[PDB]
Amino acid sequence: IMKLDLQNKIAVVSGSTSGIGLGIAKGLASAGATVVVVGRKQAGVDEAIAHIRQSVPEASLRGVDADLTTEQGAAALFAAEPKADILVNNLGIFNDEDFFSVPDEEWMRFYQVNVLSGVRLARHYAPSMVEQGWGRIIFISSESGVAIPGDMINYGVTKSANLAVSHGLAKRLAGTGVTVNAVLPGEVDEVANMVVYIASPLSSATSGAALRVDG
Amino acid sequence: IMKLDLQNKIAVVSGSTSGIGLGIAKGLASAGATVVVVGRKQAGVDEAIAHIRQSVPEASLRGVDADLTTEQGAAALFAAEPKADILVNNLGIFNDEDFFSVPDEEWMRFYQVNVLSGVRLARHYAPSMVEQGWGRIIFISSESGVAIPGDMINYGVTKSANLAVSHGLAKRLAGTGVTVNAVLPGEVDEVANMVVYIASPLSSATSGAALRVDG
Amino acid sequence: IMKLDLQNKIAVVSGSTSGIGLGIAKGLASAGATVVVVGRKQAGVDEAIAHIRQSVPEASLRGVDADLTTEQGAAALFAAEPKADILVNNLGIFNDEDFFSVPDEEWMRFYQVNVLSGVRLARHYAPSMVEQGWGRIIFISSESGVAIPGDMINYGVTKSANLAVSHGLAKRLAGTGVTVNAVLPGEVDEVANMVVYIASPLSSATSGAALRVDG
Amino acid sequence: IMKLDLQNKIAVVSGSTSGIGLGIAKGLASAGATVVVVGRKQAGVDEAIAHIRQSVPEASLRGVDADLTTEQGAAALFAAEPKADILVNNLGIFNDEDFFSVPDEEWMRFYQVNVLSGVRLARHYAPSMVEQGWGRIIFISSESGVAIPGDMINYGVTKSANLAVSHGLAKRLAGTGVTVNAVLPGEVDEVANMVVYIASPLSSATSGAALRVDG
């Protein structure tokens, strides 16, 4: 007598060539999903796929070398992978430039890279999820999003913007089989476990939430 | 390739003879734990165990007929079940008496029944969890705890008090292997799935959180 | 051209013989209200009234020597001061006893002293406020109420319980002229300024809020 | 014996030619400040100044006809009004376009109009505030910012982004005499009363907060 995290589903994970994204990809692969590793450089994609195979032997893995911060990379991903049952928004940049030194262009660029990329991926993949009556959309945002640090104001603003995006799209997709949730990290596999549970069919009564996986 | 919710652990669940508590007990049993069903009347305990066996055939189930709102019932439970790896605080009462009609005795009784019972169970079972280096303590509190309704002020106060209890004991037990979390319901098995994941060894990086399982 | 914080109103403040309560009393007195200083010992009440007069010369001040933690002291206060336009709940105790050492009696006593005292005062003074169509009820709760520390679990539980009380009674008294709000301190006159604004007729569109006055 | 909201200070208020902004301007003027009314059309600026004078007779009022959403309008405002002791960020647009119909350009435009305009004004006016050791920066954001509606996802994202901006810049300007706070409306003068108190020297121990003025 046990309970399972199991998939015959397709899961795309942005920025999955390193760190938390790679751990999420490896966990979803170990759960039996078809995981799409997406990075700007094909070399990093290949090395991430190899790392995943090291741990999960019979892993179901594809790769797309694209820059999801731009519309061109998003279109390339949509061409190679038109359908996703699980979307994991994890691509994001970060600096610590002082508030009075960061110009308008940098604010707009951080918004376009950290927020609008996930919005693009969700806008593309959500309709088919709604049609099949089941879907999972998961935003990975740091705890800096709830309490903006003060030396990283741009980044915290983008993180809370992502939290808002996931909350609002959850309310918008309510009633369908698609859930939208955010996951907050601060042991990488421990973080990935929560993303796996959320992507699993068991998290079906959790939408518009923010789930913490800090220490 | 899949991922598991599995137990060789003992899990006691208060008020587990009906409703959300019974669903939590059934889910933990299906996950392979040894679930202790606790109710005031032994008849209800037996019927709940039978209901659980209906769905999970080889279920590992014990029962204790006790009134956990009182110290006598808590002592009886501690005599029959001295050790727990997983504790699920779910016993609680509720009315809708107008704020200006409810007297002091009723405020104190609601606090003793809804809050201090869980405090008693946690105070007893937490030390052995800390000694073995692993444990799970889970509070089931309604969404009325975050936004106190106004026609149910006593109940909402007790619910937010429970949220405070779980947050504080999580911080107190940090560094040990024991996590303390709260779960917020508003499909009973869907609620139970979150409690099962939290009770599972995978939720090991989630402590002091409030997890929603509303629609 | 200026704007005023002015009163012809009666304001009772619990635990107003020292510290934050005394500062709140002095600020409300300087704003022109009739402030009732309440403490267990008449000597402390007299010395607090004298301190207030030191700063505000033509202060409107009465005193009641009562122990508001008990029903007897509350009844004495209601006998000496049957009507209040402004109620400020500030009486509360605090220790740092370890969670596993504090017994049931101490949990119940902290609830009765820190939470039920304010509930008693509000239950008595709110109806006349609702009748005259205007009233202010203000709970003073520390920031430990939103993030329970872990070494002061009982106190944080009571503080969040008070926050719940104020939120719920605000919703219950909505539509009337009575507002219920909580004020969170961590310069005592700086704290008192917020309480004065809330007690003033200008805060009339703020009910069920938690207002911070930390550094 | 009373307490005062008084100014010899300069207060600039964006989008102050109508609605909540005009009410905030009128309240700050009645409190005795020098209020700068800023709108895109000089006709609207003049009519707003006239409306303010109708209620406060000896009002201290200047005007700037500029479009603060653009850098050109912000530079014009900074040329006409190089110094501000009080800054009130209120300029913002809003639609209800469905999430799947709103394109990238619209997301970026909403971010630039609703968020980056206030960031520009704050970046310009905050240093002189920090130099003189006293300042107030106030963001007016709707309650849609804390609970993103779902049919207005772009707008709610921008509102929570503004909340993040004010929180982070408050932490960044902590220790100086400048406070940064957000005010949440859902009787316009009732809203303006809170902004006036925050702009007043009495709100000096409140920074990084979100203050509600809904019904």
Side-chain angles (χ1 to χ4, degrees), chain A residues 3-39 42-71 73-142 144-158 160-215, chain B residues 3-39 42-71 73-142 144-158 160-215, chain C residues 3-39 42-71 73-142 144-158 160-215, chain D residues 3-39 42-71 73-142 144-158 160-215:
Chain A
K3 292 175 54 133
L4 290 119
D5 292 345
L6 166 64
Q7 282 88 350
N8 194 106
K9 294 127 163 40
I10 293 196
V12 311
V13 185
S14 49
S16 40
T17 52
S18 79
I20 321 98
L22 182 48
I24 290 182
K26 163 147 68 150
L28 294 161
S30 79
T34 299
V35 178
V36 181
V37 181
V38 201
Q42 176 73 55
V45 183
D46 298 326
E47 307 188 289
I49 298 265
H51 169 101
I52 299 193
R53 292 209 221 266
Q54 274 180 45
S55 309
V56 47
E58 301 307 300
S60 167
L61 305 171
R62 306 173 206 157
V64 190
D65 65 318
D67 188 359
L68 304 103
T69 67
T70 89
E71 159 144 48
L77 167 76
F78 304 158
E81 303 282 352
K83 177 129 184 301
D85 309 275
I86 293 159
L87 167 55
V88 172
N89 280 317
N90 186 66
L91 191 35
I93 66 176
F94 141 82
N95 66 47
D96 60 351
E97 283 302 280
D98 189 71
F99 168 85
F100 300 103
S101 74
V102 47
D104 300 9
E105 311 92 53
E106 275 268 292
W107 287 92
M108 296 283 284
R109 188 177 69 91
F110 263 61
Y111 191 67
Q112 181 197 91
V113 158
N114 295 347
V115 182
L116 188 65
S117 53
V119 169
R120 238 194 314 268
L121 301 190
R123 180 167 68 234
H124 179 251
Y125 287 121
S128 321
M129 300 183 181
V130 173
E131 215 217 328
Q132 74 188 1
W134 189 95
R136 299 292 192 260
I137 306 171
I138 305 163
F139 290 76
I140 278 64
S141 207
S142 98
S144 290
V146 316
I148 309 319
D151 50 353
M152 335 191 296
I153 309 195
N154 202 174
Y155 169 65
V157 164
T158 67
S160 34
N162 281 334
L163 294 162
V165 163
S166 99
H167 201 302
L169 194 41
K171 274 203 237 208
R172 160 71 172 86
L173 296 173
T176 80
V178 193
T179 80
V180 186
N181 296 289
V183 169
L184 282 93
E187 83 148 280
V188 172
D189 299 329
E190 271 176 326
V191 176
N193 288 353
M194 176 85 253
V195 179
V196 161
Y197 168 80
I198 288 305
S200 96
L202 307 168
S203 63
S204 88
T206 289
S207 201
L211 303 104
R212 321 216 335 262
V213 286
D214 38 37
Chain B
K3 292 175 54 133
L4 290 119
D5 292 345
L6 166 64
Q7 282 88 350
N8 194 106
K9 294 127 163 40
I10 293 196
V12 311
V13 185
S14 49
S16 40
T17 52
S18 79
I20 321 98
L22 182 48
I24 290 182
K26 163 147 68 150
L28 294 161
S30 79
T34 299
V35 178
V36 181
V37 181
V38 201
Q42 176 73 55
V45 183
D46 298 326
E47 307 188 289
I49 298 265
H51 169 101
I52 299 193
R53 292 209 221 266
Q54 274 180 45
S55 309
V56 47
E58 301 307 300
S60 167
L61 305 171
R62 306 173 206 157
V64 190
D65 65 318
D67 188 359
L68 304 103
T69 67
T70 89
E71 159 144 48
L77 167 76
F78 304 158
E81 303 282 352
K83 177 129 184 301
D85 309 275
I86 293 159
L87 167 55
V88 172
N89 280 317
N90 186 66
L91 191 35
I93 66 176
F94 141 82
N95 66 47
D96 60 351
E97 283 302 280
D98 189 71
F99 168 85
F100 300 103
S101 74
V102 47
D104 300 9
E105 311 92 53
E106 275 268 292
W107 287 92
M108 296 283 284
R109 188 177 69 91
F110 263 61
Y111 191 67
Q112 181 197 91
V113 158
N114 295 347
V115 182
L116 188 65
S117 53
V119 169
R120 238 194 314 268
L121 301 190
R123 180 167 68 234
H124 179 251
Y125 287 121
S128 321
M129 300 183 181
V130 173
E131 215 217 328
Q132 74 188 1
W134 189 95
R136 299 292 192 260
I137 306 171
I138 305 163
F139 290 76
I140 278 64
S141 207
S142 98
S144 290
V146 316
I148 309 319
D151 50 353
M152 335 191 296
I153 309 195
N154 202 174
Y155 169 65
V157 164
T158 67
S160 34
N162 281 334
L163 294 162
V165 163
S166 99
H167 201 302
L169 194 41
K171 274 203 237 208
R172 160 71 172 86
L173 296 173
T176 80
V178 193
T179 80
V180 186
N181 296 289
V183 169
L184 282 93
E187 83 148 280
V188 172
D189 299 329
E190 271 176 326
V191 176
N193 288 353
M194 176 85 253
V195 179
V196 161
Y197 168 80
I198 288 305
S200 96
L202 307 168
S203 63
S204 88
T206 289
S207 201
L211 303 104
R212 321 216 335 262
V213 286
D214 38 37
Chain C
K3 292 175 54 133
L4 290 119
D5 292 345
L6 166 64
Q7 282 88 350
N8 194 106
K9 294 127 163 40
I10 293 196
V12 311
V13 185
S14 49
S16 40
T17 52
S18 79
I20 321 98
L22 182 48
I24 290 182
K26 163 147 68 150
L28 294 161
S30 79
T34 299
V35 178
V36 181
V37 181
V38 201
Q42 176 73 55
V45 183
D46 298 326
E47 307 188 289
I49 298 265
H51 169 101
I52 299 193
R53 292 209 221 266
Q54 274 180 45
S55 309
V56 47
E58 301 307 300
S60 167
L61 305 171
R62 306 173 206 157
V64 190
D65 65 318
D67 188 359
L68 304 103
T69 67
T70 89
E71 159 144 48
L77 167 76
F78 304 158
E81 303 282 352
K83 177 129 184 301
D85 309 275
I86 293 159
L87 167 55
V88 172
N89 280 317
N90 186 66
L91 191 35
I93 66 176
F94 141 82
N95 66 47
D96 60 351
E97 283 302 280
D98 189 71
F99 168 85
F100 300 103
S101 74
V102 47
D104 300 9
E105 311 92 53
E106 275 268 292
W107 287 92
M108 296 283 284
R109 188 177 69 91
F110 263 61
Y111 191 67
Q112 181 197 91
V113 158
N114 295 347
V115 182
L116 188 65
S117 53
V119 169
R120 238 194 314 268
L121 301 190
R123 180 167 68 234
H124 179 251
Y125 287 121
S128 321
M129 300 183 181
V130 173
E131 215 217 328
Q132 74 188 1
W134 189 95
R136 299 292 192 260
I137 306 171
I138 305 163
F139 290 76
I140 278 64
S141 207
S142 98
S144 290
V146 316
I148 309 319
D151 50 353
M152 335 191 296
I153 309 195
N154 202 174
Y155 169 65
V157 164
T158 67
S160 34
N162 281 334
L163 294 162
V165 163
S166 99
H167 201 302
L169 194 41
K171 274 203 237 208
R172 160 71 172 86
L173 296 173
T176 80
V178 193
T179 80
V180 186
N181 296 289
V183 169
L184 282 93
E187 83 148 280
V188 172
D189 299 329
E190 271 176 326
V191 176
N193 288 353
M194 176 85 253
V195 179
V196 161
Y197 168 80
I198 288 305
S200 96
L202 307 168
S203 63
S204 88
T206 289
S207 201
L211 303 104
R212 321 216 335 262
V213 286
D214 38 37
Chain D
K3 292 175 54 133
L4 290 119
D5 292 345
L6 166 64
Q7 282 88 350
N8 194 106
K9 294 127 163 40
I10 293 196
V12 311
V13 185
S14 49
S16 40
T17 52
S18 79
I20 321 98
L22 182 48
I24 290 182
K26 163 147 68 150
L28 294 161
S30 79
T34 299
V35 178
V36 181
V37 181
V38 201
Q42 176 73 55
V45 183
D46 298 326
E47 307 188 289
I49 298 265
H51 169 101
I52 299 193
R53 292 209 221 266
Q54 274 180 45
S55 309
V56 47
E58 301 307 300
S60 167
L61 305 171
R62 306 173 206 157
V64 190
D65 65 318
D67 188 359
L68 304 103
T69 67
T70 89
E71 159 144 48
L77 167 76
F78 304 158
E81 303 282 352
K83 177 129 184 301
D85 309 275
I86 293 159
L87 167 55
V88 172
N89 280 317
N90 186 66
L91 191 35
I93 66 176
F94 141 82
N95 66 47
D96 60 351
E97 283 302 280
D98 189 71
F99 168 85
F100 300 103
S101 74
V102 47
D104 300 9
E105 311 92 53
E106 275 268 292
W107 287 92
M108 296 283 284
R109 188 177 69 91
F110 263 61
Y111 191 67
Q112 181 197 91
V113 158
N114 295 347
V115 182
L116 188 65
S117 53
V119 169
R120 238 194 314 268
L121 301 190
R123 180 167 68 234
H124 179 251
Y125 287 121
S128 321
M129 300 183 181
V130 173
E131 215 217 328
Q132 74 188 1
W134 189 95
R136 299 292 192 260
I137 306 171
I138 305 163
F139 290 76
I140 278 64
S141 207
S142 98
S144 290
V146 316
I148 309 319
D151 50 353
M152 335 191 296
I153 309 195
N154 202 174
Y155 169 65
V157 164
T158 67
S160 34
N162 281 334
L163 294 162
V165 163
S166 99
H167 201 302
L169 194 41
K171 274 203 237 208
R172 160 71 172 86
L173 296 173
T176 80
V178 193
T179 80
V180 186
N181 296 289
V183 169
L184 282 93
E187 83 148 280
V188 172
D189 299 329
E190 271 176 326
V191 176
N193 288 353
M194 176 85 253
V195 179
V196 161
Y197 168 80
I198 288 305
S200 96
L202 307 168
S203 63
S204 88
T206 289
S207 201
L211 303 104
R212 321 216 335 262
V213 286
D214 38 37

